[PDB]
Amino acid sequence: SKGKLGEKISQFKIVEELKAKGLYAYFRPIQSKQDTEVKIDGRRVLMFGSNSYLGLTTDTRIIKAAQDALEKYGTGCAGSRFLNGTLDIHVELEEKLSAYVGKEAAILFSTGFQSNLGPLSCLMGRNDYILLDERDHASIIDGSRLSFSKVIKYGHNNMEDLRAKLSRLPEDSAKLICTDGIFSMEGDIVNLPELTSIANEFDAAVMVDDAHSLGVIGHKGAGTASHFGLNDDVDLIMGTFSKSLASLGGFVAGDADVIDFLKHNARSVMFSASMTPASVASTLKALEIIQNEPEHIEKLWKNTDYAKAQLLDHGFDLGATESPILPIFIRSNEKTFWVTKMLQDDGVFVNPVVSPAVPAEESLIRFSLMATHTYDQIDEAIEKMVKVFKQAEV
Amino acid sequence: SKGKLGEKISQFKIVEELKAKGLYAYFRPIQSKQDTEVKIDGRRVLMFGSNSYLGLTTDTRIIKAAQDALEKYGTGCAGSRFLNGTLDIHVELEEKLSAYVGKEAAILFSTGFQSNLGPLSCLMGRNDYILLDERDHASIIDGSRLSFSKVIKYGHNNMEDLRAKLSRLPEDSAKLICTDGIFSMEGDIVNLPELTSIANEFDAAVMVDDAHSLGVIGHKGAGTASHFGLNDDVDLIMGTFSKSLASLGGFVAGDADVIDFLKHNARSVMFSASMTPASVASTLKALEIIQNEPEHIEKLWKNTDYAKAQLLDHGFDLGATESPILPIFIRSNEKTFWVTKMLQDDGVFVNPVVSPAVPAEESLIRFSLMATHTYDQIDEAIEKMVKVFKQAEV
């Protein structure tokens, strides 16, 4: 029955209002492969809103590995890994990821999102504590709410606040600190040296979500612990396959005892069907290419350094990024929606960040680089962004 | 740091003990397509533990649709549907599913699990209520814990308990009842006529999780509301693509206003990458086949009726199934593990259900049918189950 349900959703008017104003630019229906240019409404659009940092979703070797796995294993495993849904190739990919991030063992999940839910829901319990950076990804927030522990946020990269909040807690309790490695929004890197120093002093477990780090920072792209040299101070390395690795799924890697506990207790791996064969093979083939072909990471960072320097030369107000995510401040929700839609209509795709996610005065567009971008495409996008920021009177 | 983390996992010994006894049969590494027979350790094994109810993961038309979508769209969309991860083919599949279950609109999620998290987390809030059948799937439990509402369980298919618990609640509050359609464990069907009658009296929203119903019950497999004729008393129809539809992903279908609210507010669709092109195409091609080829549902139910009658003729104690899930009571955890492993070693794959999921005296194996099973395979599996139940002294 719909009376009270209709009341619950009655005040949600922003989408209605964006559509009526001709500003709506969510769920844009793309007609072609994710690439540096995409087809929308039959027209070519420069893509600066992707997470495919290495441009690998179009690599013919990765496509063919996925098509070969469909031929051999079919379209799905139709069960959780726990029961009838494990393939030899899942176990292969766990062993290859464990080697890549320097840990004993890994367990796959069918999404990155579910890879956070698993460890955060089942390791800390009643009378234990989870400590979260306040800017942590939604899936970390949600995973911790699925635990039976007390969840405490600390100020963004605020080591004095992390230390003070840990200091208040009973000695006779377990603690886990979970942090993004590279943070989605502003593209900044966690203070992993100080956070791990604090963790060692309080015997707190450390988990790092490397969704935006893997393929980006660390030796051969192995992520944030690899970037800092702190493999032996991080208990759990989480990743996704949907960004650099050009697929779908994710993992958590760690000590074999912890991982065996995880793979038999995490509801998000016991009660969810396993990754499709095509995505296992695509991830395996992408992981080989990231390591064997250093040019992809090389070219991502040349494009990042070039675009950041061009944006700063043209006087754009950038956030404190340390990654291929270039946050460009606009500081008005209305102007952020307008700029986003004007850029779309001029053939440039960027992602808006608006209230209520951020305060109006911190609203921005995110301009993300891929290895496969050209300096020409970058120059065309920044040319158009200068024109639209002028038209919009930012 | 690992001291307290090591203590948290120190008491988890069942897997250690199963391995040391030679009983361990979780995460069995399959080497071939999910089918009526699978390859494990180079040897053929009859598969009676699948959720591929219509045997479609091996259908060459579905394989080829998935391989064609890889060719055209590549390996991944590398973003949430909300931003850069929507394709024309996602929207197509939403429109086709909306038509199939008789609703205005649908929103895809990248797993079935995440399809529950989305509506249960974001529709009922502070001062509202979610009412859950106590046997509801883990993902429903978890989705409701992600809401800010008060979650109340009611006795399994207990309409007097549902009615009494709703009667206690403030009038000036929103309520949502969420139920499995077909329940995973015992294969029983919700009392949807009485539950919807109660829901209408209290103006509670009704959501049905049709993971085990779609492709199984309802006209042309359209699910539990279709089975009862109660489309207009169910607000939200959730499904997965990982079972009958032979893929990965899921959906929620409902009224366009509700679905627009959902697709802009559910964290599990805003902050998780979209389904791969291959799984969109496989699901679209499977959905066509389920509707156009009635023989698949036909044959699933002939196999179910034949196997249930054979099992009852041989004196097995069955649960109160109304589906292709045949729960066979053993009522000892030790015997359940032994029977499971002995059947594996004799070339028969079934799924155990043990403490702490159920009480020892209710431990059972689940024997699930597929359309593609033969009466010969059924007879061979039941022959071997009679031999092992004798050896085990059940």
Residue A253 forms beta bridges with which residues? A106, A237
Q: Of the candidates B41, B263, B230, which has an alpha carbon nearest to the alpha carbon of residue A12? A: B263
Single-letter amino acid, residue B304: T
Residues in chain A with CB shorter than 8 Å from the CB of B180 are: none
Q: Are A215 and A297 in contact (CB under 8 A)?
A: yes
Rounded to whole angstroms, how far apart are CA atoms B237 and A86?
29
User: Do the beta carbons of residue B297 and residue B244 sit within 8 Å?
Assistant: no
Q: Which residues of B touch A233 (CB under 8 A)?
A: 1
Residue B375 · residue B383 · CB < 8 Å: no
Q: How many of the other CB atoms lie within 10 Å of CB of A288?
A: 14
Supply φ then ψ for residue B44, to 5 degrees. Answer: -85, 140
Chain A stretch 287-346, residues whose beta carbon is closer than 8 A to a beta carbon of chain B: none
Neighbours of A10 (CB within 10 A): 10
- Burial degree of B160 (CB within 10 A; 0-12, 13-18, 19+): exposed
Alpha-carbon separation of residue B52 from B100, B213, B214, B289, B370 (angstroms): 19, 12, 11, 14, 6
Look at the block and give the residue holding tokens 């009983």. Answer: B23
Alpha carbon distance A229, A102 (integer Å): 11
Is A387 marked active-site? no
Residue owning tokens 């409404």? A41
Interface test with B, best of A35, A41, A75, A203 (most B CBs within 10 A): A75
- Sign of the torsion formed by the C-alpha atoms of B222, B144, A148 and B2: positive
> A311 with A382: CB under 8 angstroms?
yes
- The residues facing B129 across adjacent strands are B150, B175
- Show the tokens assigned to A25: 């630019």
Residues in A touching B68 (Cβ below 8 Å)? none
Reference B371, options B55, B35, B48; nearest CA is B55
B72, A33: Cβ pair inside 8 Å? Answer: yes
* Residue carrying structure tokens 């003070």: A164
Q: How far apart are CA A286 and CA B238, in angstroms?
A: 33
- The 3-state DSSP class for residue A47 equals strand
Coil vs helix vs strand at A357:
coil
Among A170, A118, A171, A257, which Cα is nearest to B6's? A257
Which one-letter amino acid corresponds to residue B25? A
Distances (CA, A) of A358 to A1, A26, A331, A349: 35, 17, 10, 20
DSSP state of A316: -
Please check whether residue A217 is in contact with residue A54, taking contact to mean a CB–CB distance below 8 angstroms. no
Cβ burial, residue A197 (10 Å; 0-12/13-18/19+): middle
Interface check A126 vs B, CB under 8 A: no
Residues 6+ apart with CB under 8 A from A224: A181, A182, A189, A190, A192, A208, A210, A213, A217, A218, A234
CA atoms of B147 and A145, how far apart (whole Å): 10
C-alpha to C-alpha distance for B25 and B298, rounded to whole angstroms: 32
User: Do residue A142 and residue B138 have CB atoms under 8 angstroms apart?
Assistant: no
- Collapsing DSSP states into helix, strand and coil, what is residue A364? strand
Distance CA B291, CA B34 (A): 22
The three-state secondary structure class of A363 is coil
Q: Minimal CA–CA distance to A140: which of A260, A268, A296, A303? A: A268
Compute the distance between CA of residue B58 and CA of residue B52 in angstroms, rounded to an integer: 10
B270's tokens: 């805003």
Phi, psi dihedrals of residue B180, rounded to the nearest 5°:
-60, 150
Report residue B67 as tokens: 């391989």
Peptide bond into A356 cis (omega under 30): yes
Cβ atoms of A159 and A194 closer than 8 Å:
yes
How does DSSP assign A150-214, residue by residue? EEEEE-TT-HHHHHHHHHTS-SSS-EEEEEESB-TTT--B--HHHHHHHHHHHT-EEEEE-TTTT
Q: Which of B355, B343, B348, B325 is nearest to B390 (CA)?
A: B343
d(CA A309, CA B105): 45
Whose structure tokens read 């209290």?
B202
Distance CA B321, CA B188 (A): 5
Q: Name residue A151's beta-bridge partners.
A: A130
What 3-state DSSP class applies to A30? Answer: strand
Q: Which residues of B belong to the active site? A: 184, 212, 243
Tokens 């399809």 sit on residue = B115
* Cβ–Cβ below 8 Å for A74 and B35: yes
- Residue among A277, A5, A289 at smallest CA distance from B38: A277
Does B212 belong to an annotated binding site? yes
Phi-psi region of A74 (alpha: psi -120 to 50; beta: other; left: phi over 0): left
CB-count burial class (<10 Å; 0-12, 13-18, 19+) for A17: exposed
Question: Distances from the Cα of A318 to the Cαs of A53, A211, A248, B121, B274, in angstroms?
Answer: 19, 22, 30, 34, 28
Query: Side chain identity at B273, as an amino acid letter?
Result: A
- Per the CB < 8 A criterion, the answer to whether B149 and B125 are in contact is yes
From B62, B86, B176, residue closest to A75, measured CB to CB: B62
Nearest Cα of chain A lies from the Cα of B131 at a distance, in angstroms, of 14
Residue B251's identity, in one-letter code, is F
Least Cα separation, residue A261 to chain B (angstroms) = 7
Scan residues 225-254 of A and list those with Cβ closer than 8 Å to B: 233, 235, 240-243, 246-248
Euclidean distance between CA atoms B252 and B163, whole angstroms: 26
The resolution in Å comes to 1.4
A88 burial via Cβ count (<10 Å: 0-12, 13-18, 19+): middle
The secondary structure of residue A129, as a DSSP letter, is E
Is there a binding annotation on residue B112?
yes
Structure tokens at A86: 């494990």
Q: Do A86 and B8 touch (CB under 8 A)?
A: no
Residues 6+ away with beta carbon under 8 Å from A308:
A318, A321, A326
**Are the C-beta atoms of residues A210 and A239 closer than 8 Å to each other?**
yes
Contact status of A88 with chain B (Cβ, < 8 Å): yes
Contact B9 A282 (CB under 8 A): no
Is the distance from CB of A319 to CB of A283 less than 8 angstroms?
Answer: no
The answer to whether the beta carbons of residues A277 and A67 sit under 8 Å apart is no
| Spatial distance between the Cα atoms of A253 and A274, rounded to a whole number of angstroms | 17
Rounded distance between C-alpha atoms, residue A200 and residue B2, angstroms: 9
Q: Three-state SS for A58?
A: helix
Q: Do B50 and A279 touch (CB under 8 A)?
A: no
Give dist(CA A155, CA A132) in Å, integer: 9
Task: Report the relative pairing of strands A236-240 and A250-254 from DSSP bridges.
Answer: antiparallel
Among B222, B218, B155, B225, which residue's Cα sits nearest to residue B196? B225
Q: Which chain A residue's Cα is nearest to B90?
A: A29
Q: Which among A175, A255, A273 is the nearest to B112, CB-wise?
A: A273
Full strand arrangement of the beta sheet holding A175-180? A105-109, A250-254, A236-240, A205-209, A175-180, A129-133, A150-154
Strands (E), chain A: 37-40, 43-47, 105-109, 129-133, 150-154, 175-180, 205-209, 236-240, 250-254, 325-329, 348-349, 351-353, 364-368
Burial label for B313, CB within 10 Å (0-12, 13-18, 19+), is exposed
Residues sharing a CB contact under 8 Å with residue B315, sequence separation 6 or more, in sequence order: none
As a whole number of angstroms, the distance between CA B275 and CA B117 comes to 16
Residue of chain B with shortest Cα separation from A286: B75
Instruction: Give the Cβ contact number of residue A134 at 10 Å.
Output: 12
User: In whole angstroms, what is the distance from residue A305 CA to residue B84 CA?
Assistant: 23
Contact partners, residue B390, CB within 8 Å, separation at least 6: none
In chain A, the N- to C-terminal Cα span, in Å, equals: 47
Q: What is d(CA B148, CA A360) in angstroms, rounded to the nearest whole number?
A: 25
Under 8 Å CB-to-CB from B153, ≥6 apart: which residues?
B131, B132, B133, B134
| Cβ atoms B53, B302 nearer than 8 A | no
C-alpha dihedral, B383 to B55 to B98 to A7, nearest 10°: 40
Sole residue written with tokens 């059948």: B133
What whole-number distance in Å separates Cα of residue B285 and Cα of residue B93?
Answer: 10
Q: Kind of pairing, strands A175-180 and A129-133?
A: parallel
Element (H, E) at A392: helix A375-392
Give the residues across from A189 on adjacent strands: A182
Q: Verify whether the Cβ–Cβ distance B84 to A28 is below 8 Å.
A: yes
φ/ψ of B350, rounded to 5, equals -125, 165
Q: How far apart (Å, rounded) are the C-alpha atoms in residues B82 and A188?
A: 23
Which of B190, B187, B220, B191 lies closest to B327, judged by CA? B187
**For residues A214 and A245, is the Cβ–Cβ distance under 8 A?**
yes
Listed in sequence order, the residues at least 6 apart from A391 whose beta carbon sits closer than 8 Å to its beta carbon are: A342
**Directed axis angle between helix B277-292 and helix B295-313, to 10°?**
80
Q: Is A355 assigned a catalytic role?
A: no
Residues B124 and B121: their CA atoms lie apart, in Å, by 7
Q: Is B12 annotated as a binding residue?
A: no
Query: Strand B236-240 and strand B250-254: pairing?
Result: antiparallel
Q: Is there a contact between A368 and A51 (Cβ–Cβ < 8 Å)? A: yes
Give the span between the Cα atoms of A114 and A103, in whole angstroms.
Answer: 20
Whether B111 contacts A272, CB under 8 Å? yes
3-state secondary structure chain B: CCHHHHHHHCCCCHHHHHHHHCCCCCCCCECCCCCCEEEECCEEEEECCCCCCCCHHHCHHHHHHHHHHHHHHCCCCCCECCCCCCEHHHHHHHHHHHHHHCCCEEEEECCHHHHHHHHHHHCCCCCCEEEEECCCCHHHHHHHHHCCCEEEEECCCCHHHHHHHHHCCCCCCCEEEEEECECCCCCCECCHHHHHHHHHHHCCEEEEECCCCCCCCCHHHCCHHHHHCCHHHCCEEEEECCCCCCCCCEEEEECHHHHHHHHHHCHHHHCCECCCHHHHHHHHHHHHHHHHCCHHHHHHHHHHHHHHHHHHHCCCCECCCCCCEEEEECCCHHHHHHHHHHHHHCCEECEEECCCCCCHHHCEEEEECCCCCCHHHHHHHHHHHHHHHHHHCC
With CA atoms as reference, report the closest residue to A248 among A54, A388, A52, A74. A52
| Bridge partners, residue B49, by sequence | none
On whether any CB of chain B is under 8 Å from the CB of A124, the answer is yes
Question: Solving technique for this entry?
Answer: X-ray
Whole-angstrom distance between the N-terminal and C-terminal Cα of chain B?
47
Cβ within 8 Å, pair A5-B70: no
How far is Cα A149 from Cα B4, in angstroms, rounded to an integer? Answer: 14
